[PDB]
Write a protein that binds this ligand. Structure first.
Ligand SMILES: NC(=O)c1ccc[n+]([C@@H]2O[C@H](COP(=O)([O-])OP(=O)(O)OC[C@H]3O[C@@H](n4cnc5c(N)ncnc54)[C@H](O)[C@@H]3O)[C@@H](O)[C@H]2O)c1
Ligand SMILES: NC(=O)c1ccc[n+]([C@@H]2O[C@H](COP(=O)([O-])OP(=O)(O)OC[C@H]3O[C@@H](n4cnc5c(N)ncnc54)[C@H](O)[C@@H]3O)[C@@H](O)[C@H]2O)c1
Ligand SMILES: NC(=O)c1ccc[n+]([C@@H]2O[C@H](COP(=O)([O-])OP(=O)(O)OC[C@H]3O[C@@H](n4cnc5c(N)ncnc54)[C@H](O)[C@@H]3O)[C@@H](O)[C@H]2O)c1
Ligand SMILES: NC(=O)c1ccc[n+]([C@@H]2O[C@H](COP(=O)([O-])OP(=O)(O)OC[C@H]3O[C@@H](n4cnc5c(N)ncnc54)[C@H](O)[C@@H]3O)[C@@H](O)[C@H]2O)c1
Ligand SMILES: NC(=O)c1ccc[n+]([C@@H]2O[C@H](COP(=O)([O-])OP(=O)(O)OC[C@H]3O[C@@H](n4cnc5c(N)ncnc54)[C@H](O)[C@@H]3O)[C@@H](O)[C@H]2O)c1
Ligand SMILES: NC(=O)c1ccc[n+]([C@@H]2O[C@H](COP(=O)([O-])OP(=O)(O)OC[C@H]3O[C@@H](n4cnc5c(N)ncnc54)[C@H](O)[C@@H]3O)[C@@H](O)[C@H]2O)c1
Ligand SMILES: O=C(O)[C@H]1O[C@H](OP(=O)(O)OP(=O)(O)OC[C@H]2O[C@@H](n3ccc(=O)[nH]c3=O)[C@H](O)[C@@H]2O)[C@H](O)[C@@H](O)[C@@H]1O
Ligand SMILES: O=C(O)[C@H]1O[C@H](OP(=O)(O)OP(=O)(O)OC[C@H]2O[C@@H](n3ccc(=O)[nH]c3=O)[C@H](O)[C@@H]2O)[C@H](O)[C@@H](O)[C@@H]1O
Ligand SMILES: O=C(O)[C@H]1O[C@H](OP(=O)(O)OP(=O)(O)OC[C@H]2O[C@@H](n3ccc(=O)[nH]c3=O)[C@H](O)[C@@H]2O)[C@H](O)[C@@H](O)[C@@H]1O
Ligand SMILES: O=C(O)[C@H]1O[C@H](OP(=O)(O)OP(=O)(O)OC[C@H]2O[C@@H](n3ccc(=O)[nH]c3=O)[C@H](O)[C@@H]2O)[C@H](O)[C@@H](O)[C@@H]1O
Lengths: 274, 271, 273, 267, 269, 261
């Protein structure tokens, strides 16, 4: 049982990771500046003995004593404040590697499938601390994820179809809707992160869901699961064999169950905003 | 139309203050470290042209350019030291800021001076006398309304929750003691009147209308419409009436209704 | 035998605290910024092996290794309101941080006037005791006189002694039937020491419960000075807790303490001629 | 006539840039920590009125007053962390400086973007968009000439070294090389242009490695036995009126003269 | 009428300098860490409108706005070297930022840190255009001087007041020249407000023998003390460039200094 | 075998000391800001196991771990010079204090500015902080890597001689290897008081000029140190014959000029 720092812990992925590691009996310390995350995402844990929330910006040196660091502190966007994003990914990662070096923590970087800005150099910084300072690093290349606590108003397709469907709005299908998307449910991703953190694989690893559907196939499925009278209008798949083999990991959450849950969250939010 | 800093802006009173000053077409900057306040209390304004949210702890020096400062950054109740540092070091910093850029500063003091909020007042008058800073001091009494802290064990909060949760209403004593409660919009109006007046001495902002603890328990039980059993076990604003022409105008029932709506919509969200 | 930090150690009360503890063979270190204190009040120890003066301001972090801190640093007034407050608040936090880090016991020299910055300083100590386990001691001190007191504060005692020595009229406001309790300094100093070495963390009044009337003080001093000064018209301390918890109580009789304060005021007035 | 900061000014390209801007009577200030550059590369200008050398690390904040900044502070290749810090933090600092004093900033980026120089480009455009800083971005391709690194194991360096020292020339295809003064011309044109988007600065003319070793073999004149992405600059030609004018032979002669005067000094 | 900083202002010479410049209606600000000086040397001025006392160590950067600086701040051998070097740099840094003229109270002892201090002054002058004046001060005496330093004037006065024997090393034929403090302060002001940027000696050319001194002091005090046995300054440059010279007759100065030592000795009862 | 810090290591004397201490298998760390020194003076050692070059200004605090410090960091820019000699020197004594290192001050025969107080600062640390210190009072040295363009007499005659330029008093010159041997001898002894390290052997301004004229082979037209304390306390003395020393210095002046055509 380990003392774990999660930067970006109050965000979409960070909060679900937090829930998981607290249930597993670890001392989870969350660092977040609430630039894109929410205190509500982790409030359930405030006061519990093995939890602590620190309102800190990773661009500022952080001194704490831990065995692991899940480095997830990076804002997402539809880029809202490009300079702050670039500062966070670079200076932010250097500080968390500095911290990892001083106290001997293993650090996992939440990288992105978008490497195929600031997250490219971030991977490189990890590998430079590994090679040069003996820091243990793990690098996850994360693909499209969805679920409760995701950003609803970013203009991604899952968020759009879910909002439009709940609001009786027409579901806007760009193109012929034959193009394809692959979505992983957040608990699968969390399972992947933990597995990669505790493996011995220091090279990059893709965590995504290889199963694709057509954008339209998605729109019809969301329409049904919501049960709205909404109308439909018109206007790089992940390879996870390295995770299947090295980590014995793969997404197991059926798509319908993942969407049901995301929908329950979008519904709860929309009524709350009344 | 003025550039206004509201420290503690993301809290209960601070957020309602924010709404009103944005509706009036001012440039509002909210500073808050979210120790007791919430981003949700101000999210409606993020992105808006005349608005900005800064995640800053007032215990740290803050450099910004403004004409007014509503200094409300003080936690309610936990971490007694952080509280004392905030009321003292925080207040010194905001006055330093008021001094350097010539802003008028209003301190959200409390009827509890009749810790750290006493010295804060003293610190304000010392900057006025010694450095010519313009200061205003509001002595705030019991307030309630949407976005208040539900789980503090305050009486309005307990009764609304118990009534909403079908639970019995706990009346300590015979419930004949009395309380005076002010609705949040009334307080916000009062604060603005005090900020823009010429009165630098302390001014009470509260509601003189008193009710019995039991009348409150009874009134809330009815406005909620709960089958809850009831079990058993004053501000003087005449200086505000005359110097500011201010007074609470929200009838108790209307205020309680809005607050009950908030507690409910909240309880549903946490299900 | 201890290592003791006295902040404000060059002031009226500080210097006599320093005298006693020094004579007791402790490692006394004085910290003072001479705002209202005087190098002369300690100079007698400069050079001696177990003493050290450090020109420091308590609003600035201080790092040092001690067993105890007698925190007496707060300027006397009749002056610079902002500085007094930063000192009572920021200054006290630092010495409380200092006591936390090195495990020192901190005695706060508080005041009877709590019945500014002094009130929240008490709170600041009890906050650190609860939250951080710092051992704190809180003394509520009452009117104090003696050598090295401030002479031109226009307190009643300094005024009567001043006017008396100068042959001036003694100015008694109203009928002088109002009353004051005064405590001699060595009594206060013994009380602080007893307090700092007891197990009482709750506040302990230190004062002289023996009241007198303003007219009587003026009369008595007049008699002790033997001047041709004409008199012209224009909350008691409860120390039972200290008697019971510390076996302490003022034992220096008024006139003896008055004589001594007269001898100091005289020596000064001559020096300044 | 402008006050100009050149980071990495004491380096291979930085120094040739330095020469030309001085000759033009500007107040050139060079910043360099001598991690890969050499004081010798700029010593001639020390003392001249319009010149100054500051031994400073761009990873540390720099407060100075200029109209322009040529940001060339990037090590060539060793110490991966210092390199990444230099490229990211160093660059942020220079944009901050550019932001505070209203200086125009040109980034000496690399053809290798087709590390830390990618994000460096991005940081620049974010300051353009967010803080209104004027930025210019040059994508530099293989350059050669006097003051180049002789012992990097690049091919031009190898063949010259091997040839002068009678060594066999190790030919393991085509490469396109640009002479350093042409690049300098480009840098200056782009800096004073209005093109804020990226511009390639390189020489499109290719030869085979064997063709090179032979040209070098002859230009040096040794009996050494030989053993065993082209740049598109049409955008510079059109927006800057720039193009390489130094013939490959003339450029190699100059580089060979440098390597020859260096080996002798190390005898 | 000028805003004047006096480092070491709370010391022997600094306070007399402080006095005279306050008498002249200037805004005098004193900086002192009370390492060798006393709040008493200047308390007479605390509260006055044109005065301020700042408890500051010149080894720490100091930011203030002034037209002049009399740098007299000089006293544990290391603190001494730091004060003379770093202290002086800081005061020149300040002089540069605010365009103040700076006077260095150097010493006749250059014929440590006061040698290099001079070099630093001329270096800021030459390189940054800071205006500097440099006084080479010879032996000074008077009220508020250090009594227990073991100087000869100090010893003889103390021994004489206390009936102790007056300890004269050698046959007492060696010679010393002593300047009274009020002369020196005038000397300092004349040099500050001249255009002479080169060094200037401020001392009393008048010499006497040590034995001659002990006898003069012995008479002016009137004690039954027994006498036991066990570089003259050239101010011609000051006479001509500043029209300055000591005017306090030796007797009058010694009288005043003796009064101070006496008043102090009773006070210490 | 000792971990040695050498400030000014990239300078004329600092580098030869650097060479000689490396050949001896010590862990040499050079601190230099390249104000008057050259990276080239030490590049030969870059990469080697017992060596490190650090670009640091001694006026800024330096934190490192060593057994010894040869403080030669001293350079035109008078303020910077005085700052380097005073604050620079305080730091190296501060550092020597924190890590218990022995410190050597490369002082100069000119104490007979900023190098006077340096001596003064060192002894204050010895006395007050028990820091062990050594002080060498160095006279005029010559050799490869010297500042050629200083206007010293040997330098002037060599430049004039090496360039066909036209060229009764005594000047005493010490060769660099001699100085270096002397410095190490002073470092690893127990004499903490000042020691003159120079060459007592004198020649005439006129002899020198005649000697240089011939050693170059051009058509060119034409306070003595007391080291008895060093001879005795360190058993040290200059051994490099004047001609051989001049030859090496001349060879340097030549290689540089050609490098500069
Ligand atoms: N969501 C995806 O599909 C996806 C895809 C690729 C990569 N990722 C990576 O996973 C991580 C989490 O993504 P997410 O969707 O949960 O994003 P998110 O916006 O929900 O969470 C990021 C969290 O980091 C915090 N943060 C941002 N800047 C910070 C700073 N300077 N200091 C401290 N905290 C800061 C934010 O407030 C937020 O709570 C990110 O690093 C992201 O790049 C996610
Ligand atoms: N609500 C009442 O009944 C009442 C009564 C008397 C006085 N007041 C005063 O009115 C003001 C508003 O109080 P409230 O009840 O809305 O409390 P609140 O907790 O809702 O608001 C306090 C806000 O200030 C912020 N804050 C706390 N510490 C801070 C720090 N160090 N730096 C920056 N921000 C910080 C908190 O996050 C919070 O958002 C307070 O000053 C309070 O003392 C309120
Ligand atoms: N004398 C009384 O009758 C009386 C009554 C009640 C309380 N007290 C308390 O006793 C304590 C001492 O009082 P006193 O009569 O000795 O007053 P004093 O003024 O003689 O002593 C205060 C000392 O603290 C020093 N000081 C002030 N600010 C400082 C700072 N920021 N840093 C360092 N030193 C600083 C002053 O120079 C002075 O020497 C005080 O805390 C006071 O409030 C005294
Ligand atoms: N050589 C090429 O053909 C080529 C190709 C692509 C890009 N570039 C770019 O051109 C620029 C110069 O290239 P070059 O061959 O002249 O490189 P170089 O190594 O000759 O020069 C880089 C200079 O920057 C200095 N420097 C490095 N880190 C520093 C720091 N932290 N602070 C201050 N100074 C620092 C070095 O000491 C050196 O003099 C670089 O940005 C490089 O990326 C060159
Ligand atoms: N008295 C003489 O005969 C004589 C002779 C030659 C030169 N001087 C020079 O005149 C100047 C004043 O002499 P003095 O007799 O008044 O000496 P002094 O010790 O009486 O005065 C020096 C003052 O400077 C202060 N000081 C010392 N170090 C300080 C620091 N780091 N920061 C701030 N203040 C500090 C001391 O507290 C003291 O008040 C000195 O520079 C001295 O070198 C005096
Ligand atoms: N060579 C001589 O004739 C001679 C004679 C007597 C004394 N000395 C002394 O020996 C020492 C070295 O002499 P040199 O002839 O080798 O000089 P040099 O100029 O060749 O070397 C001095 C070195 O110190 C470095 N330096 C300067 N300021 C610095 C700072 N602030 N931080 C770090 N490094 C800095 C310079 O870059 C230079 O490399 C000097 O202290 C000098 O005074 C030399
Ligand atoms: O630039 C360099 O040459 C050096 O950079 C780093 O050293 P440094 O960057 O000084 O310190 P790090 O240990 O890398 O720390 C990096 C950053 O993390 C921050 N940090 C450090 C420790 C910590 O607990 N928390 C924390 O936020 C510090 O602010 C620091 O700026 C490397 O560790 C060295 O190998 C490298 O040679
Ligand atoms: O101690 C003293 O004697 C002096 O203390 C203060 O001066 P100071 O605290 O230095 O500066 P202030 O402007 O009073 O600032 C108070 C605090 O506010 C902070 N501050 C200042 C300015 C600002 O814009 N923002 C800000 O957060 C500073 O960190 C500072 O700690 C008083 O203003 C002076 O009257 C007083 O004489
Ligand atoms: O604000 C908070 O939440 C924190 O406030 C304090 O921590 P902090 O004020 O950071 O540090 P302290 O150790 O209490 O020191 C207070 C001050 O004393 C000063 N200090 C500390 C140690 C020392 O030896 N000397 C000294 O002057 C420091 O400058 C510091 O500003 C409490 O100790 C923490 O429990 C609390 O979590
Ligand atoms: O090192 C250098 O090359 C430069 O050193 C100095 O510049 P610097 O010492 O950085 O700044 P100064 O203006 O000389 O200030 C010296 C000291 O004075 C102090 N200072 C400065 C300004 C002030 O208002 N008050 C004050 O006490 C500062 O703490 C600083 O450490 C010289 O001014 C330059 O001519 C020189 O070229």
């Amino acid at each position: 049982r380990k003392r774990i720092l999660i930067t970006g812990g109050a965000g979409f992925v960070g909060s679900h990771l937090t829930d998981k590691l607290m249930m597993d009996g670890h001392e989870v310390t969350v660092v977040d500046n609430f630039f894109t995350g929410r205190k509500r995402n982790v409030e359930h844990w405030i006061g519990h003995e093995n939890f602590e929330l620190i309102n800190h910006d990773v661009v500022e040196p952080l001194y704490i004593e831990v065995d692991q660091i899940y480095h997830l502190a990076s804002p997402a966007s539809p880029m809202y404040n490009p300079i702050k994003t670039l500062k966070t990914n670079t200076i932010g990662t250097l500080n968390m590697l500095g911290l990892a070096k001083r106290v001997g923590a293993r650090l996992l970087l939440a990288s992105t499938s978008e490497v195929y800005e600031g997250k490219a150099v971030a991977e490189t910084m990890c590998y430079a601390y590994m090679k040069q300072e003996g820091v243990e690093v793990r690098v996850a290349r994360i693909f499209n994820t969805f679920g409760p606590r995701m950003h609803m108003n970013d203009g991604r397709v899952v968020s759009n179809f879910i909002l439009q469907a709940l609001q009786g709005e027409p579901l806007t299908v760009y193109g012929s809707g034959s193009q394809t998307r692959a979505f992983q449910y957040v608990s699968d991703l969390v399972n992947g992160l933990v597995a990669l953190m505790n493996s011995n694989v220091s090279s990059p690893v893709n965590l995504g869901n290889p199963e694709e559907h057509t954008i339209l196939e998605f729109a019809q499925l969301i329409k049904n699961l919501v049960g709205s009278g909404s109308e439909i209008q018109f206007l790089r798949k992940p390879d996870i064999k390295k995770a299947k083999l090295m980590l014995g990991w793969e997404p197991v959450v059926p798509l319908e169950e993942g969407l049901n849950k995301a929908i329950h969250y979008f519904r709860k939010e929309l009524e709350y905003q009344a």
